[PDB]
Short mmCIF file of C-alpha atoms in Angstrom, two decimals:
data_model
loop_
_atom_site.label_atom_id
_atom_site.label_comp_id
_atom_site.label_asym_id
_atom_site.label_seq_id
_atom_site.Cartn_x
_atom_site.Cartn_y
_atom_site.Cartn_z
CA UNK A 1 -16.96 13.20 4.60
CA UNK A 2 -20.18 14.75 6.13
CA UNK A 3 -23.75 13.48 6.66
CA UNK A 4 -26.25 14.04 3.88
CA UNK A 5 -28.84 15.27 6.40
CA UNK A 6 -26.59 17.85 8.10
CA UNK A 7 -27.12 21.63 8.05
CA UNK A 8 -30.93 21.67 7.80
CA UNK A 9 -33.14 23.80 10.04
CA UNK A 10 -36.94 23.41 10.11
CA UNK A 11 -38.91 26.23 11.76
CA UNK A 12 -42.47 24.86 11.96
CA UNK A 13 -45.25 27.17 13.12
CA UNK A 14 -46.59 24.45 15.48
CA UNK A 15 -45.67 21.24 17.34
CA UNK A 16 -46.33 17.80 15.79
CA UNK A 17 -49.99 16.86 15.97
CA UNK A 18 -51.43 20.35 16.56
CA UNK A 19 -53.35 23.11 14.77
CA UNK A 20 -51.79 26.30 13.43
CA UNK A 21 -53.71 29.53 13.79
CA UNK A 22 -54.22 32.09 11.03
CA UNK A 23 -55.98 35.43 11.45
CA UNK A 24 -57.84 36.22 8.18
CA UNK A 25 -57.10 39.93 8.42
CA UNK A 26 -53.82 40.03 10.33
CA UNK A 27 -52.06 36.90 9.02
CA UNK A 28 -50.96 33.66 10.63
CA UNK A 29 -49.57 34.04 14.14
CA UNK A 30 -46.20 32.44 13.45
CA UNK A 31 -45.53 34.58 10.39
CA UNK A 32 -46.49 37.91 11.93
CA UNK A 33 -44.46 37.00 15.01
CA UNK A 34 -41.54 35.92 12.82
CA UNK A 35 -41.57 39.09 10.72
CA UNK A 36 -41.74 41.37 13.77
CA UNK A 37 -38.67 39.75 15.33
CA UNK A 38 -36.73 39.77 12.04
CA UNK A 39 -37.52 43.46 11.45
CA UNK A 40 -36.08 44.39 14.85
CA UNK A 41 -33.30 41.80 15.21
CA UNK A 42 -32.70 39.85 11.99
CA UNK A 43 -29.29 41.37 11.38
CA UNK A 44 -27.99 41.20 14.97
CA UNK A 45 -29.30 37.89 16.44
CA UNK A 46 -28.34 34.26 15.88
CA UNK A 47 -30.97 32.13 14.13
CA UNK A 48 -31.85 30.17 17.29
CA UNK A 49 -32.01 33.38 19.30
CA UNK A 50 -34.39 34.73 16.67
CA UNK A 51 -36.64 31.69 16.62
CA UNK A 52 -36.63 31.32 20.40
CA UNK A 53 -38.02 34.85 20.71
CA UNK A 54 -40.55 33.89 18.05
CA UNK A 55 -41.51 30.91 20.17
CA UNK A 56 -42.00 33.26 23.11
CA UNK A 57 -44.11 35.77 21.20
CA UNK A 58 -46.45 33.17 19.74
CA UNK A 59 -46.80 31.51 23.14
CA UNK A 60 -47.59 34.71 25.05
CA UNK A 61 -49.12 37.27 22.69
CA UNK A 62 -51.72 35.04 21.02
CA UNK A 63 -55.00 33.39 22.02
CA UNK A 64 -57.76 32.41 19.60
CA UNK A 65 -60.87 34.62 19.75
CA UNK A 66 -63.66 32.33 18.59
CA UNK A 67 -67.39 31.80 19.20
CA UNK A 68 -67.60 27.98 18.92
CA UNK A 69 -66.24 27.23 22.43
CA UNK A 70 -64.52 24.14 21.05
CA UNK A 71 -62.01 26.71 19.69
CA UNK A 72 -62.33 29.41 22.38
CA UNK A 73 -59.17 30.78 24.03
CA UNK A 74 -56.73 28.23 22.54
CA UNK A 75 -52.94 28.62 22.38
CA UNK A 76 -50.01 27.76 20.08
CA UNK A 77 -46.29 27.00 20.40
CA UNK A 78 -43.97 26.74 17.34
CA UNK A 79 -41.31 24.08 16.98
CA UNK A 80 -37.66 24.44 15.83
CA UNK A 81 -35.80 21.41 14.44
CA UNK A 82 -32.12 22.13 14.00
CA UNK A 83 -29.57 19.95 12.25
CA UNK A 84 -27.26 22.98 11.97
CA UNK A 85 -23.58 22.52 12.75
CA UNK A 86 -22.66 26.19 13.36
CA UNK A 87 -24.11 29.42 14.62
CA UNK A 88 -25.87 31.35 11.87
CA UNK A 89 -25.94 35.14 11.58
CA UNK A 90 -27.33 36.98 8.57
CA UNK A 91 -24.22 39.28 8.33
CA UNK B 1 -14.40 29.02 14.35
CA UNK B 2 -18.02 28.47 15.34
CA UNK B 3 -20.11 30.50 12.85
CA UNK B 4 -21.24 29.60 9.35
CA UNK B 5 -19.05 31.37 6.81
CA UNK B 6 -21.02 34.33 5.48
CA UNK B 7 -18.49 35.71 3.08
CA UNK B 8 -20.12 35.06 -0.18
CA UNK B 9 -21.30 37.07 -3.13
CA UNK B 10 -24.86 36.44 -2.20
CA UNK B 11 -26.79 35.58 0.92
CA UNK B 12 -28.86 33.15 -1.19
CA UNK B 13 -32.24 32.31 -2.74
CA UNK B 14 -35.45 32.63 -0.70
CA UNK B 15 -38.31 30.70 -2.32
CA UNK B 16 -41.80 31.48 -0.95
CA UNK B 17 -44.76 29.27 -1.83
CA UNK B 18 -47.96 31.16 -1.09
CA UNK B 19 -50.84 28.69 -1.39
CA UNK B 20 -54.15 30.48 -0.94
CA UNK B 21 -56.65 28.64 -3.15
CA UNK B 22 -57.25 24.89 -3.34
CA UNK B 23 -59.28 22.62 -5.60
CA UNK B 24 -62.76 21.90 -4.22
CA UNK B 25 -62.03 18.14 -4.22
CA UNK B 26 -59.43 18.62 -1.48
CA UNK B 27 -62.13 20.09 0.74
CA UNK B 28 -59.61 22.77 1.72
CA UNK B 29 -60.78 26.32 2.33
CA UNK B 30 -59.36 29.62 1.08
CA UNK B 31 -56.50 30.66 3.37
CA UNK B 32 -57.44 34.25 4.08
CA UNK B 33 -54.57 36.20 5.59
CA UNK B 34 -51.97 34.37 3.53
CA UNK B 35 -51.19 37.13 1.00
CA UNK B 36 -50.50 39.39 3.91
CA UNK B 37 -48.09 36.85 5.29
CA UNK B 38 -46.42 36.41 1.95
CA UNK B 39 -46.05 40.18 1.48
CA UNK B 40 -44.54 40.61 4.97
CA UNK B 41 -42.24 37.62 4.56
CA UNK B 42 -41.07 38.91 1.19
CA UNK B 43 -40.15 42.36 2.53
CA UNK B 44 -38.36 40.88 5.59
CA UNK B 45 -36.31 38.38 3.63
CA UNK B 46 -35.46 40.92 0.93
CA UNK B 47 -34.18 43.25 3.64
CA UNK B 48 -31.91 40.54 5.01
CA UNK B 49 -30.25 40.14 1.59
CA UNK B 50 -31.98 37.10 0.02
CA UNK B 51 -33.07 37.01 -3.62
CA UNK B 52 -36.73 36.42 -2.87
CA UNK B 53 -39.06 34.60 -5.29
CA UNK B 54 -42.79 34.25 -4.59
CA UNK B 55 -44.84 31.41 -6.12
CA UNK B 56 -48.62 31.32 -5.77
CA UNK B 57 -51.35 28.67 -5.80
CA UNK B 58 -48.93 25.85 -6.59
CA UNK B 59 -49.84 22.27 -7.40
CA UNK B 60 -48.08 19.38 -5.69
CA UNK B 61 -46.16 18.60 -8.87
CA UNK B 62 -45.19 22.26 -9.19
CA UNK B 63 -43.92 22.36 -5.60
CA UNK B 64 -41.71 19.37 -6.22
CA UNK B 65 -40.45 20.50 -9.59
CA UNK B 66 -39.54 24.07 -8.62
CA UNK B 67 -37.89 22.75 -5.46
CA UNK B 68 -36.05 20.08 -7.44
CA UNK B 69 -34.85 22.64 -10.00
CA UNK B 70 -33.74 25.05 -7.29
CA UNK B 71 -31.71 22.17 -5.84
CA UNK B 72 -30.05 21.77 -9.25
CA UNK B 73 -29.01 25.42 -9.70
CA UNK B 74 -25.46 26.48 -8.82
CA UNK B 75 -25.23 27.80 -5.26
CA UNK B 76 -21.41 28.03 -5.15
CA UNK B 77 -21.54 31.80 -4.61
CA UNK B 78 -24.39 31.68 -2.05
CA UNK B 79 -24.02 31.54 1.75
CA UNK B 80 -27.34 29.73 2.46
CA UNK B 81 -30.75 28.75 1.09
CA UNK B 82 -34.22 29.50 2.45
CA UNK B 83 -37.70 28.19 1.60
CA UNK B 84 -41.02 29.25 3.18
CA UNK B 85 -44.22 27.21 2.86
CA UNK B 86 -47.63 28.79 3.49
CA UNK B 87 -50.43 26.29 3.02
CA UNK B 88 -52.78 23.79 4.60
CA UNK B 89 -51.04 20.88 6.25
CA UNK B 90 -51.39 17.68 8.23
CA UNK B 91 -48.63 15.81 10.02
CA UNK B 92 -45.57 15.21 7.78
CA UNK B 93 -47.52 16.65 4.86
CA UNK B 94 -48.27 19.96 3.13
CA UNK B 95 -51.08 20.80 0.74
CA UNK B 96 -50.75 21.92 -2.81
CA UNK B 97 -53.72 23.03 -4.88
CA UNK B 98 -53.87 19.44 -6.12
CA UNK B 99 -53.74 17.60 -2.82
CA UNK B 100 -51.02 16.50 -0.41
CA UNK B 101 -47.24 15.97 -0.52
CA UNK B 102 -44.74 14.91 2.17
CA UNK B 103 -42.55 17.66 3.54
CA UNK B 104 -39.56 15.27 3.69
CA UNK B 105 -39.76 14.72 -0.06
CA UNK B 106 -39.71 18.48 -0.71
CA UNK B 107 -36.67 18.98 1.54
CA UNK B 108 -34.84 15.83 0.44
CA UNK B 109 -33.84 17.59 -2.79
CA UNK B 110 -31.27 19.60 -0.79
CA UNK B 111 -29.49 16.71 0.98
CA UNK B 112 -25.71 16.85 0.80
CA UNK B 113 -25.50 14.06 -1.75
CA UNK B 114 -28.25 15.67 -3.92
CA UNK B 115 -27.19 19.33 -3.86
CA UNK B 116 -23.41 19.53 -3.71
CA UNK B 117 -23.26 23.30 -4.06
CA UNK B 118 -25.10 23.73 -0.73
CA UNK B 119 -22.84 21.24 1.10
CA UNK B 120 -21.78 22.54 4.54
CA UNK B 121 -24.19 25.48 4.10
CA UNK B 122 -27.44 26.11 6.02
CA UNK B 123 -30.75 25.14 4.38
CA UNK B 124 -33.66 26.82 6.14
CA UNK B 125 -37.32 25.80 5.86
CA UNK B 126 -40.04 27.90 7.52
CA UNK B 127 -43.41 26.12 7.46
CA UNK B 128 -46.75 27.72 8.31
CA UNK B 129 -49.23 24.84 8.21
CA UNK B 130 -51.20 22.58 10.52
CA UNK B 131 -49.49 19.43 11.70
CA UNK B 132 -52.64 17.69 12.89
CA UNK B 133 -55.88 18.46 14.72
CA UNK B 134 -55.06 18.55 18.48
CA UNK B 135 -55.69 21.80 20.36
CA UNK B 136 -53.56 23.51 23.01
CA UNK B 137 -55.99 24.67 25.71
CA UNK B 138 -53.37 26.58 27.73
CA UNK B 139 -52.96 27.20 31.45
CA UNK B 140 -52.90 30.44 33.49
CA UNK C 1 -52.31 31.61 29.77
CA UNK C 2 -49.38 29.76 28.15
CA UNK C 3 -49.36 26.68 25.86
CA UNK C 4 -49.20 23.31 27.51
CA UNK C 5 -46.51 22.14 25.08
CA UNK C 6 -44.19 25.13 25.65
CA UNK C 7 -40.72 25.01 27.21
CA UNK C 8 -39.69 21.52 26.08
CA UNK C 9 -36.38 20.64 24.43
CA UNK C 10 -35.62 17.30 22.81
CA UNK C 11 -31.98 16.55 22.06
CA UNK C 12 -32.21 13.44 19.90
CA UNK C 13 -29.05 11.55 18.95
CA UNK C 14 -30.22 11.21 15.30
CA UNK C 15 -32.74 12.41 12.72
CA UNK C 16 -36.11 10.67 12.23
CA UNK C 17 -35.80 7.38 10.39
CA UNK C 18 -32.07 6.86 10.84
CA UNK C 19 -29.63 4.71 12.78
CA UNK C 20 -27.82 5.87 15.92
CA UNK C 21 -24.32 4.51 16.40
CA UNK C 22 -22.72 3.04 19.53
CA UNK C 23 -19.08 1.99 19.85
CA UNK C 24 -19.13 -1.04 22.23
CA UNK C 25 -15.89 0.06 23.90
CA UNK C 26 -16.05 3.87 23.71
CA UNK C 27 -19.79 4.62 24.13
CA UNK C 28 -22.45 6.00 21.81
CA UNK C 29 -21.35 8.80 19.45
CA UNK C 30 -23.91 11.35 20.63
CA UNK C 31 -23.09 10.88 24.33
CA UNK C 32 -19.31 11.13 24.07
CA UNK C 33 -19.69 14.25 21.92
CA UNK C 34 -22.23 15.71 24.36
CA UNK C 35 -20.05 15.02 27.39
CA UNK C 36 -16.99 16.48 25.64
CA UNK C 37 -18.76 19.79 24.98
CA UNK C 38 -20.39 19.89 28.42
CA UNK C 39 -17.06 19.26 30.17
CA UNK C 40 -15.46 22.23 28.39
CA UNK C 41 -18.45 24.58 27.96
CA UNK C 42 -21.47 23.50 30.04
CA UNK C 43 -21.40 26.59 32.27
CA UNK C 44 -20.54 29.31 29.71
CA UNK C 45 -22.60 28.54 26.58
CA UNK C 46 -26.33 28.67 25.86
CA UNK C 47 -28.13 25.35 25.45
CA UNK C 48 -28.51 25.77 21.66
CA UNK C 49 -24.86 26.77 21.31
CA UNK C 50 -23.91 23.61 23.22
CA UNK C 51 -26.07 21.25 21.17
CA UNK C 52 -25.03 22.91 17.92
CA UNK C 53 -21.36 22.25 18.72
CA UNK C 54 -22.40 18.67 19.61
CA UNK C 55 -24.15 18.37 16.23
CA UNK C 56 -20.88 19.48 14.59
CA UNK C 57 -18.63 17.04 16.46
CA UNK C 58 -20.89 14.05 15.70
CA UNK C 59 -21.04 15.06 12.03
CA UNK C 60 -17.28 15.50 11.56
CA UNK C 61 -15.37 13.37 14.06
CA UNK C 62 -17.29 10.12 13.61
CA UNK C 63 -17.51 7.51 10.85
CA UNK C 64 -18.63 3.92 11.32
CA UNK C 65 -15.86 1.31 10.88
CA UNK C 66 -17.51 -2.00 9.93
CA UNK C 67 -16.58 -4.83 7.57
CA UNK C 68 -20.07 -5.53 6.12
CA UNK C 69 -20.15 -2.78 3.43
CA UNK C 70 -23.88 -2.35 4.14
CA UNK C 71 -22.68 -0.56 7.31
CA UNK C 72 -19.24 0.65 6.13
CA UNK C 73 -18.23 4.32 6.54
CA UNK C 74 -21.66 5.62 7.58
CA UNK C 75 -22.41 8.98 9.19
CA UNK C 76 -24.78 10.56 11.70
CA UNK C 77 -26.31 13.97 12.44
CA UNK C 78 -28.23 14.53 15.72
CA UNK C 79 -31.49 16.47 15.86
CA UNK C 80 -32.54 19.23 18.28
CA UNK C 81 -36.24 20.00 18.77
CA UNK C 82 -36.77 23.20 20.75
CA UNK C 83 -40.02 24.51 22.14
CA UNK C 84 -38.00 26.75 24.45
CA UNK C 85 -39.18 30.37 24.84
CA UNK C 86 -36.02 31.83 26.46
CA UNK C 87 -32.27 31.37 26.28
CA UNK C 88 -31.01 28.75 28.72
CA UNK C 89 -27.68 28.96 30.54
CA UNK C 90 -26.77 26.58 33.36
CA UNK C 91 -25.55 29.45 35.58
CA UNK D 1 -35.39 39.58 30.04
CA UNK D 2 -34.49 36.89 27.46
CA UNK D 3 -33.10 34.05 29.62
CA UNK D 4 -34.78 31.47 31.82
CA UNK D 5 -34.70 32.46 35.48
CA UNK D 6 -32.00 30.34 37.17
CA UNK D 7 -32.07 31.76 40.72
CA UNK D 8 -33.50 28.76 42.57
CA UNK D 9 -32.20 26.52 45.31
CA UNK D 10 -31.69 23.54 43.00
CA UNK D 11 -30.91 23.30 39.31
CA UNK D 12 -33.38 20.39 39.27
CA UNK D 13 -33.78 16.62 39.02
CA UNK D 14 -31.96 14.68 36.30
CA UNK D 15 -33.37 11.22 35.68
CA UNK D 16 -31.08 8.98 33.66
CA UNK D 17 -32.65 5.75 32.38
CA UNK D 18 -29.82 3.38 31.34
CA UNK D 19 -31.21 0.26 29.59
CA UNK D 20 -28.42 -2.26 28.83
CA UNK D 21 -29.86 -5.77 29.02
CA UNK D 22 -33.12 -6.86 27.39
CA UNK D 23 -35.63 -9.68 27.77
CA UNK D 24 -35.32 -12.59 25.34
CA UNK D 25 -38.85 -11.79 24.07
CA UNK D 26 -37.72 -8.50 22.52
CA UNK D 27 -34.80 -10.20 20.79
CA UNK D 28 -32.65 -7.08 21.20
CA UNK D 29 -28.98 -7.35 22.00
CA UNK D 30 -26.87 -6.04 24.82
CA UNK D 31 -26.02 -2.34 24.49
CA UNK D 32 -22.33 -2.57 25.23
CA UNK D 33 -20.75 0.76 26.01
CA UNK D 34 -23.94 2.12 27.55
CA UNK D 35 -22.46 2.12 31.10
CA UNK D 36 -19.53 4.27 29.96
CA UNK D 37 -22.14 6.64 28.58
CA UNK D 38 -24.23 6.80 31.76
CA UNK D 39 -21.26 7.37 34.05
CA UNK D 40 -19.95 10.16 31.81
CA UNK D 41 -23.45 11.60 31.67
CA UNK D 42 -23.64 11.23 35.44
CA UNK D 43 -20.50 13.30 36.04
CA UNK D 44 -21.39 15.93 33.42
CA UNK D 45 -24.91 16.50 34.63
CA UNK D 46 -23.84 16.46 38.26
CA UNK D 47 -21.10 19.00 37.51
CA UNK D 48 -23.73 21.25 35.94
CA UNK D 49 -25.70 21.09 39.22
CA UNK D 50 -28.44 18.46 38.64
CA UNK D 51 -29.62 16.02 41.27
CA UNK D 52 -28.90 12.96 39.11
CA UNK D 53 -30.26 9.46 39.67
CA UNK D 54 -29.46 6.52 37.36
CA UNK D 55 -32.07 3.75 36.98
CA UNK D 56 -30.99 0.59 35.14
CA UNK D 57 -32.64 -1.96 32.86
CA UNK D 58 -36.09 -0.46 33.32
CA UNK D 59 -39.33 -1.97 32.13
CA UNK D 60 -41.80 0.18 30.22
CA UNK D 61 -44.09 0.38 33.27
CA UNK D 62 -41.20 1.56 35.46
CA UNK D 63 -40.24 4.26 32.96
CA UNK D 64 -43.81 5.57 32.87
CA UNK D 65 -44.05 5.42 36.64
CA UNK D 66 -40.61 6.98 37.16
CA UNK D 67 -41.52 9.90 34.92
CA UNK D 68 -45.02 10.18 36.18
CA UNK D 69 -43.78 10.46 39.71
CA UNK D 70 -41.11 12.92 38.97
CA UNK D 71 -43.72 14.93 37.31
CA UNK D 72 -45.79 14.87 40.52
CA UNK D 73 -42.98 15.88 42.90
CA UNK D 74 -42.79 19.55 43.90
CA UNK D 75 -40.47 21.60 41.68
CA UNK D 76 -41.13 25.08 43.14
CA UNK D 77 -37.47 25.38 44.21
CA UNK D 78 -36.11 23.91 40.94
CA UNK D 79 -34.96 25.82 37.86
CA UNK D 80 -35.59 23.01 35.38
CA UNK D 81 -35.94 19.26 34.82
CA UNK D 82 -33.80 16.94 32.75
CA UNK D 83 -34.38 13.36 31.65
CA UNK D 84 -31.88 11.25 29.69
CA UNK D 85 -32.87 8.03 27.89
CA UNK D 86 -30.26 5.49 26.71
CA UNK D 87 -31.86 2.46 25.02
CA UNK D 88 -32.80 0.73 21.80
CA UNK D 89 -35.32 2.64 19.77
CA UNK D 90 -37.48 2.97 16.71
CA UNK D 91 -39.21 6.11 15.56
CA UNK D 92 -41.44 7.89 18.11
CA UNK D 93 -40.75 5.01 20.46
CA UNK D 94 -38.27 3.85 23.13
CA UNK D 95 -37.48 0.33 24.37
CA UNK D 96 -37.87 -0.91 27.91
CA UNK D 97 -36.55 -4.30 28.98
CA UNK D 98 -39.95 -5.86 28.16
CA UNK D 99 -40.68 -3.89 24.93
CA UNK D 100 -41.61 -0.46 23.54
CA UNK D 101 -43.42 2.61 24.83
CA UNK D 102 -44.08 5.89 23.00
CA UNK D 103 -41.67 8.72 23.75
CA UNK D 104 -44.63 11.13 23.71
CA UNK D 105 -46.19 9.27 26.64
CA UNK D 106 -43.01 9.62 28.71
CA UNK D 107 -42.80 13.37 28.16
CA UNK D 108 -46.50 14.27 28.30
CA UNK D 109 -46.43 14.03 32.11
CA UNK D 110 -44.58 17.37 32.08
CA UNK D 111 -47.05 19.33 29.94
CA UNK D 112 -47.94 22.65 31.53
CA UNK D 113 -51.40 21.52 32.53
CA UNK D 114 -50.03 18.31 34.13
CA UNK D 115 -47.10 19.67 36.17
CA UNK D 116 -47.71 23.20 37.44
CA UNK D 117 -44.45 23.50 39.40
CA UNK D 118 -42.40 23.22 36.19
CA UNK D 119 -44.63 25.72 34.37
CA UNK D 120 -42.56 28.20 32.33
CA UNK D 121 -39.40 26.24 33.24
CA UNK D 122 -37.34 24.22 30.75
CA UNK D 123 -37.97 20.48 30.42
CA UNK D 124 -35.02 18.75 28.75
CA UNK D 125 -35.03 15.29 27.17
CA UNK D 126 -31.82 13.81 25.78
CA UNK D 127 -32.49 10.63 23.81
CA UNK D 128 -29.84 8.18 22.55
CA UNK D 129 -31.71 5.58 20.43
CA UNK D 130 -32.40 4.59 16.84
CA UNK D 131 -35.27 6.39 15.14
CA UNK D 132 -35.55 4.04 12.20
CA UNK D 133 -33.46 2.13 9.69
CA UNK D 134 -32.44 4.60 6.95
CA UNK D 135 -28.67 5.05 6.77
CA UNK D 136 -26.62 8.18 6.10
CA UNK D 137 -24.05 7.24 3.46
CA UNK D 138 -22.18 10.57 3.67
CA UNK D 139 -20.45 12.68 1.02
CA UNK D 140 -16.83 13.91 0.85
#
């Protein structure tokens, strides 16, 4: 017997309660960060290693460029929820 | 051993829901940038080995039904399952064209007791959506 | 600038909405599993590797023994929330 | 370039909050077994290198003050911070002896803008507590 909720992983683009930023011409930050990392390392890194680097890239490479100063120079951190029971490699 | 068994015929299905346009009643704006995200996601997840499927401008009922049917397919020869949601969101909740639906109810379809052919196999959900309205002002 | 919510990790004993089980004479399931893995692997494995093996041991090794069939033969999966931006080793 | 810098004088503080006995007003029972947990946690986290301190049967105000103060100490020579909570719980929320306090309010004291000496350093929270009343019936 095993738990019905086991072996899920949720990679949210942002932490509970917060905004998620989307560039109209370049795409949402989380996705473009995610695709970059997967292109370079999807076949050689473990899923948490992948998403941790994604966390880093969204946290460091991105800051909202906006005119309304209510939204000027804001930041974003994604949020990984893992119920996985093993390491996961795509190979 | 400590890794998920990857010796299957297929890596698995990758369902992408690319919600760009919303009914005016929801007050939700057009999500510019999203097709670009969907195109990049599709190429990445194809390259990894997933059978990628892209759905566009889905209603709440469509999101539940296509997720419920995917749960009912036979995944015996698949190593894992992946779903990617691109839409408007608020906490615990993702937007369809129609309005709002809880994320837990979309993912519940794949619980061990409700999707036996994915038992002991990873079920991945990537979610690009707001989870509220707070802002992260940063620090140097 | 970096996000104010970055670099947190929450190792919850259970998933949102669910019970968390405690044996009155042997300790809570999550803790004994966590201490087991830390005793053997705390200094050689990355934090996500550690908590993933903990997730596995709680899912497989534990099943509630109670007479009231409302609580008979129930299961548990813990839940890791990572806003980490780097790999973490305790060495 | 992909791991947290660990070359500091201390691994860091590890606050363990071990709530066993509760006020009659809360109606919650004695958490038997919780002192076996804390002592095992104490040895494990000490063996890793943490400066561990175990506080017992804490009120909500003490838990907020404990964590607020730890947040205000000087962590320049610390690699990280760890806090462990053993108590009764319901979702988003942890029990003191007197009642309940939101888990978010315990952790917020360590946000980057509120604790500069732990900036860019891991902040770990281990939480043994119920998060609701759904039950996981399993599957063979």
